Amino acid sequence: GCTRTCGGPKCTGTCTCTNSSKCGCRYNVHPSGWGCGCACS
Numbered sequence: 001g002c003t004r005t006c007g008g009p010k011c012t013g014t015c016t017c018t019n020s021s022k023c024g025c026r027y028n029v030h031p032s033g034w035g036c037g038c039a040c041s
Contacts, residue, residue, distance in 0.1 A: 004038040011036030 006013025006025040013025030013036075020040035027036035 006036065006038060013038060015040065 002015075002017035002019065004013075004015045004017075006015075008025070011025075011027035015023040015025060015038040017023050017040060023038070023040035025036060025038050028034050
């Protein structure tokens with residue numbers, strides 16, 4: 001199965017999913033909902 005882990009200082013982390021390649025945690029600072037989570041690109 002895939003993997004998702006986060007909990008860094010400035011909202012960060014690491015993620016790995018066979019479905020994708022370049023995965024990882026990202027922090028959103030937009031007005032339309034903010035927060036940091038795991039997302040691939």
